[PDB]
Swiss-Prot record, chain A:
Stated family: Belongs to the UTP11 family.
Annotated localization: Nucleus, Nucleolus
Biased segments, Basic and acidic residues type: 15-24
Designated name of the protein: U3 small nucleolar RNA-associated protein 11
Location of this fragment in the whole protein: 1 to 108 of 270
GO cellular component: nucleolus; small-subunit processome
Domain of life assignment: Eukaryota
Region annotated Disordered, chain positions: 1-24
A GO BP annotation: rRNA processing
Role: Involved in nucleolar processing of pre-18S ribosomal RNA.
Keywords: Nucleus, Ribonucleoprotein, Ribosome biogenesis, rRNA processing
Length: 108, 119, 146, 67, 83, 297
RNA sequence: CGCAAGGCUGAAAAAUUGACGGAAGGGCACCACCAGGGGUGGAGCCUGCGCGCGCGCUACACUGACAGAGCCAGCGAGUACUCCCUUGGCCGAGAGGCCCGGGUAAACUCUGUCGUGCUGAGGAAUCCCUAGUAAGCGCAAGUCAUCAGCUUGCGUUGAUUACGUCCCUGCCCUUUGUACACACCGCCCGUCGCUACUACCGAU
């Protein structure tokens, strides 16, 4: 049980460190750090597998009405060197009319 | 059901009825007659209609917009344009419903994807 | 041993053996990482003499240490003093008395003495979606990055 | 392995899939296409055949002759 | 020719597979070897027991083709390791 | 066409999930039918379910048909089992060697209806595309190490399973001279399978015996002169290819005509060769504790 | 617990449906013909299979070398990746960390400078190959089996010659069935078995 064990039965076992001749390579990854690494990789691969399923089973004739108010991801040919697959969003700025810029420049 | 269970014509017409309903897309399985007991349903027919099946295929966004688009006549099923919003799309014509020839909705999709070929 | 080149699963492991004869003896052996990743010695490596290819369970890191746990037999020594006390007898000393008498310090390895390990909190990089997949997936699930 | 092959060949049992007729369902007797109470159960079977003729006509006409 | 056809032809030559002879034909056979030839047939028509090259010899010298038995050699080596 | 392949694969996966739930219910319904015929008392949780009785009255007959074996299970092979001759093409890896191309020819000649295709510069999704575009039943890919083949990939189409296996002890047809070998007879081969007993063994038996065209069942027990043998020990299926004459009613002379393998499968995926992200059905569990003790198939 | 669990013994048929062929006529095949192409086999290296054998890799010159100019890809992102080992010196009571030494393409296009100079493209055989195929080229990955002496992808450049015929070598099949009109064909052949009946021969 738990009362049938001495304090030397309860005593913790210490963890060894990376050798000092090899400490420049980083920390020695043990089971806990390996579990963190494996959890992050399995999570990222699960998201990527779901994205690959969604890109495979895509209707080529789909029509949402946000397509008339968004700029598409395009291709590398149409966009150019600045091509990421992400749809570009708006930063909030807008082209500003001349009367309001006349007001702002009088204030400045 | 009321026929005896080891009957040849019962077994043959069970397979015929289940295959016919699964080919029309009403049932989702073809291995139970309780599907025709409590799964065949006027809502199953009405969701095999055309604006709901293109809502599911994401040709439109909502069934209201889909009924508006197939009343304006952008949607063909196969090779023939469909103006009736009650055309029951079966399971093998859900692979052939698409936009019409000179469609402005098709130009909108191609203009979004930046593949607007004007030829 | 120590990893030399690390691919997705197969890692080349360097400072463990000295020759392809020793690797051919220890072919198929259950090799293990300190972290817990299992693996198997697959094939001796030709051009650096003493390295080998071992296919692991998942990707190991260059900081890791790759161990192989063999069991070497130990035979006891066949020494026998009688403790003839009424006649007289030579008593073999203990190792502490030997070290204090003939003045040799006890062997102590600094890599073996336990230390406190400063672990930084593990933060990982965000998800990096490829460009072709990110341009091919549909509108409801398209990535929006300003 | 050679003796296993010889035993199967001699007391010949082979695990090849056999060519079945494509119309085993509708034509189970395999007739040739050239020159050629229980009454309650028979009446029930004929009623189901009549019902299925009507219902199959209605379902094919409602799917608009894609079937 | 095929292996099937040459096997049938060699067994017809050795008289193991031919037509059902009458008692008069058996009288002629008892009026007028085959295991020694059947050993050669069962060795020749099962050529994968032993390792052979396909090209034949590279340079023909004339002076007066099974080059190894891998099955028998592997069984012999395993018996040596058992011992 | 491609939308139809995707739609039919999705319908197949949904029907398989519904079959899982319906099997969980139909294990309870078979106790009610056996208790009705034999009169042994059954569990109260089964006998007091009104939905189960009300639906049991309609779904007797498929359980009786499955007991008699009159119907066949929902499978990717049961649609076209003995109706169509399965066409199958054998291909190499990208830049094959001469012994890999001769081995590809040899295992083409193993199947009487197969064809061989030169890879050259052929992207693997377009290979899958051309297979579905020409309605092939099976593709088989080959991988060599250095003039000796080390892997097969048997993929069933339109959406069927892959079996990837590694080859060992390959003795080619192209090593023995033409005086001793000859042109292999192309008759429809008999098949024998020895040692497959698990449902996974019957799975690999199905995806291996639906590569061959169906034999005419009128007099197949005595006619036909060519046999192909798949026999497994320690889940490494070993395959021979013999040709035989029946030299008497009690004896038979065999003659080894084709290549010898002992292929070991390491991956059976419910999805074709292009899908690297398909859900696996079985894979060779190395680096586990008792994965070497446990024998599958 | 009961049965299984007592040795005329001493290793190496079926057939009215069967056994084997022949002749004629078809179909197919880069394991066939025909037209071409490409390997291997010559020298060296080495995995593998049993000193030998092939499979890859490398070298072998007109398709040249040197210097410039211009212009092209696709698959690839796990807080993860590193080629050794050392002469010295720094800061190091000691273990270490430093510094300085030693061992997004190839291709292609255009323009010039020099000119065959151990500075030599593989015999008999044997095998493979018919369109984005043969062949050249690089780049990337290393996915529970296999694979670094390599494997598998990915793009780039992209031909000649067949695409006919069963004449050779073969393989499969017809001569029974499986549908009916027009239309055409018109009892394929041999050696035996088995069964039924008939009479014969000679011992008991």
């Amino acid at each position: 049980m738990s009362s049938l064990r001495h304090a030397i039965q309860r005593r913790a076992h210490k963890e060894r460190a990376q050798p000092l001749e090899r400490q420049r390579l980083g920390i020695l990854e043990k089971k806990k750090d390996y579990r963190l690494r494996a959890r992050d990789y399995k999570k990222k691969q699960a998201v990527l597998k779901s994205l690959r399923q969604k890109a495979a089973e895509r209707n080529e004739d789909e029509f949402y009405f946000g397509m008339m108010s968004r700029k598409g991801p395009g291709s590398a040919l149409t966009r150019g060197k600045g091509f990421t697959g992400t749809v570009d969003g708006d930063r909030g700025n807008k082209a500003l009319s001349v009367e309001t810029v006349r007001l702002l420049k009088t204030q400045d | 059901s009321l026929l005896p269970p080891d009957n040849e014509v019962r077994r043959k017409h069970e397979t015929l009825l289940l295959d016919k309903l699964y080919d029309m897309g009403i049932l989702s399985t073809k291995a139970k007659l309780s599907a025709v007991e409590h799964n065949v349903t006027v809502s199953a027919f009405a969701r095999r209609r055309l604006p709901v099946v293109m809502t599911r295929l994401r040709m439109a966004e909502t069934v209201q917009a889909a009924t508006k688009l197939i009343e304006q006549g952008h949607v063909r099923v196969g090779v023939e344009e469909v103006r009736d919003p009650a055309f029951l799309v079966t399971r093998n014509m859900e692979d052939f419903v698409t936009w019409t020839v000179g469609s402005k909705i098709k130009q909108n999709i191609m203009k979004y994807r930046d593949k607007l070929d004007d030829f | 041993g120590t990893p030399w080149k690390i691919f997705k699963n197969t890692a080349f492991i360097k400072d463990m053996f000295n020759s392809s004869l020793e690797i051919a003896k220890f072919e198929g052996a259950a090799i293990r990482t300190v972290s817990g990743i299992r693996g198997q010695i697959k094939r001796a490596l030709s051009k650096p003499e003493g390295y080998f290819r071992a296919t692991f369970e998942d990707k190991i890191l260059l900081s890791d240490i790759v161990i192989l746990k063999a069991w070497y037999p130990v035979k006891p020594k066949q020494f026998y003093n009688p403790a003839t006390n009424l006649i007289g007898w030579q008593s073999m000393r203990l190792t502490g008395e030997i070290r204090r008498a003939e003045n040799i310090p006890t062997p102590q390895n600094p890599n073996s003495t336990y230390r406190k390990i400063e672990r930084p909190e593990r933060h990982f990089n965000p998800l990096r979606v490829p460009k072709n997949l990110a341009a091919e997936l549909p509108f409801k699930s398209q990535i929006v990055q300003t | 392995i050679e003796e296993l092959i010889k035993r199967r060949i001699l007391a010949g049992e082979f695990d090849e899939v056999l060519r079945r007729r494509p119309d085993m369902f509708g034509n189970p007797h395999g007739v040739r296409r050239g020159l050629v109470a229980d009454e309650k159960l028979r009446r029930d079977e004929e009623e189901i055949k009549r019902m299925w003729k009507e219902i199959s006509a209605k379902l094919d006409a409602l799917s608009s002759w894609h079937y | 020719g095929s292996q099937l056809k040459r096997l049938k032809a060699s067994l017809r030559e050795q008289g193991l597979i031919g037509p059902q002879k009458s008692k008069k034909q058996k009288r002629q056979n008892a009026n007028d070897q085959k295991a020694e030839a059947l050993k050669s047939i069962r060795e020749q028509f099962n050529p994968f027991q032993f390792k052979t090259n396909a090209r034949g010899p590279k340079f023909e010298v004339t002076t007066n083709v099974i080059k190894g038995r891998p099955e028998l050699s592997r069984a012999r080596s395993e018996e040596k390791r058992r011992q | 066409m491609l939308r139809k392949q995707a739609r039919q694969r999705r319908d197949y996966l949904y029907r398989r999930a519904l079959l899982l739930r319906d099997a969980e219910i139909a294990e309870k319904r078979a106790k009610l039918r056996a208790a009705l015929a034999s009169g042994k008392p059954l569990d109260p949780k089964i006998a007091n379910d009104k939905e189960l009785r009300k639906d049991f009255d309609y779904d007797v007959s498929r359980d009786i048909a499955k007991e008699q074996g009159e119907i066949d299970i929902d499978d990717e092979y049961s649609e076209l089992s003995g109706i169509v001759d399965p066409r199958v093409l054998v291909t190499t890896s990208r830049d094959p060697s001469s012994r890999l191309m001769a081995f590809s020819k040899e295992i083409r000649l193993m199947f009487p209806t197969a064809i061989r295709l030169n890879r050259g510069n052929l992207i693997l999704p377009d290979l899958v595309m051309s297979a579905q575009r020409e309605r092939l039943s099976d593709i088989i890919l080959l991988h060599e190490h250095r003039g000796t083949p080390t892997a097969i990939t048997i993929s069933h189409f339109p959406h069927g399973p892959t079996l990837m296996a590694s080859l060992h002890n390959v003795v080619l047809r192209a090593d023995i001279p033409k005086s001793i070998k000859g042109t292999v007879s192309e008759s429809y081969p008999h098949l024998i399978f020895e040692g497959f007993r698990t449902p996974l063994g019957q799975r690999v038996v199905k995806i291996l015996k639906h590569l061959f065209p169906p034999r005419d069942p009128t007099n197949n027990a005595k006619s036909g002169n060519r046999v192909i043998t798949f026999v497994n020990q320690d889940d490494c299926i070993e395959v021979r290819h013999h040709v035989y004459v029946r030299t008497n009613y009690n004896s038979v002379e065999l003659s080894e005509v084709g290549p010898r393998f002992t292929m070991r499968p390491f991956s059976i995926t419910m999805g074709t060769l292009e899908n690297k992200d398909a859900d696996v059905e079985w894979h060779l569990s190395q680096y586990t504790r008792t994965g070497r003790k446990k024998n599958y198939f």
